[model samples]
Target: QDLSEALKEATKEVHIRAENSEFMRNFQKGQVSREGFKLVMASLYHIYTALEEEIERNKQNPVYAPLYFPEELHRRAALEQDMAFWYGPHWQEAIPYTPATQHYVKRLHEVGGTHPELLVAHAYTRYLGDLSGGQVLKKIAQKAMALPSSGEGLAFFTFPSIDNPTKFKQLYRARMNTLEMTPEVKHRVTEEAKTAFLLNIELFEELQALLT
Candidate 1:
């Protein structure tokens, strides 16, 4: 089987955990409040900040080569722009990090130093999720909160480099399948992807409680 398929199979349970999460359930039901969404955006700001930094730090590694697609999928700037709109001009200072978000950032930092190649798993989880459901999310968030079509509040959902999301993700998975890795490394990467989804679920839960 292709490594992409393997990764998918590996993450199946964690993916279900995330899907069943109250935060995502609310998002799907269009029950997410404006403040709750803002909380999510704030949480993502720190997560992407760490992930992108780890990507930059690991760019020279051989294991990360085939899957590294920074120019096409980086999200920190877009997240920053959206945060500014939600939290104001000095959004960085006002943004709050739940323990889960903080822990995820710490995981990224450790991955940067100890196991840089695992970056591929994170890159896959985040950017692909962005390309996938992020499209639906932009619309739901806009209508649920009555945001404008000008893309003022949903900058985080709009990817500049990805003009065609379906085709891009096709190319992305192909690249991932081709990445060179030992079975052990592949297994570890799969575990990390599971961990990534779990971290996301935690953030979702934490934010839900915060906005409650």
Candidate 2:
């Protein structure tokens, strides 16, 4: 299998596990609070910040070069917009990062240094997720919170640069399949992709604990 499908197939079960998480269940049932979502965003602020920073730092790397579709895939700026909307203009000063969030960010930073290509796994997990079910999440948040459909509290789910998400992701997967790497490096990327999902599940578990 190619990198894109390999990444998808490898992480499928773990992704299912994450979607079944308490935080996501609460989110789907419209039981989550504005504060709950805010706290979730707090952690994500760190994760995306670190993840995108690493993507930027490694854009020139051969493995990531083909997959780094920055215009259509970067999330840090959208996350920042959502942060300011939910936590105020000085949002960074207000919200605290959970230890889980810190751990996730720390790993991304490690990839930025020691294992830059592992970022393809991280990128695949995050960006593809946002493009997929993350849109349902956007709508769920809007309706649950009774926010306007004007994309007010939901910048994280709206990819303005991506005109057709379905088609765009097809292109994304195509590009991912083209990554230049040794077979050993390719195998490691898929393994890291699974780790990426496991890390996300940890973050969700932490969020549920925080909200409780």
Candidate 3:
């Protein structure tokens, strides 16, 4: 729990850093106006608030535990797949179609380079599995629904098999039980997860703040 608490605090800082970054500043100032900047900001705010709520909710859940290694790796793979599709293929094509989207995509890639860990953690922990992870992905999907395409620009959210989640959860639970980590290590992983969340928050908020 102490680790979780530490992670939560660290994640808040991460959000702050992202929100304040140069890429976000340019984005807020209409430099990335092609991709519905206003809508993106709104979506991001919703995401941050939702994340905070989920973090609190999970803390109260006894079933929630720190992610183990191979399980985390599995989740990471899924995330990488999503990002590759989104930024690499989807964004490349779609960005040229919309001015706002163009800036958005460029900035995303630029920022991604600066904070690759955020993306890695997001893919592995938040976008890949059930509970904290699954819920985050679902929320992203929901937000994407309100974006330019019903889901065209957000291929990263779509999973091919709905049943995969159930299987993944079962496997993940078993994996967690099998981890060689001590309780302290488990706590540390949880803290890292929380830190990842906070970093995103900071990144978005700093971006939003720059608009003014």
User: CA RMSD for every model?
Assistant: 1.2, 1.0, 11.6
Best candidate per TM-score, number?
2
Candidate-wise lDDT, in order: 0.85, 0.86, 0.42
**Model 1 lDDT vs. the true structure?**
0.85
Candidate achieving higher TM-score, 1 or 3: 1
For 114-186, candidate 3 gives per-residue lDDT tens digits of 4322222333344433444334434444454343444444433445544466566556545445434456555
Off by over 4 Å in 2: none
Q: Write the per-residue lDDT of candidate 2 for residues 1-212, one digit (tens) a residue.
A: 78787878888888889899989998988897888998888788899989988888988988688887878888788888888899898887888889999999999999877898788889888888898889888888888888887887788888999899999989989998888767898899999888888899999998888777
In order of appearance, the predictions have TM-scores of 0.96, 0.97, 0.40
Between candidates 2 and 3, the one scoring higher on TM-score is: 2
Rank candidates by TM-score, best first.
2, 1, 3
Off by over 4 Å in 1: none
Q: After best superposition, candidate 1 residue 90: deviation in angstroms?
A: 1.3
Over 4 Å off in model 3, which ranges? 1-124, 128-150, 161-167, 210-212
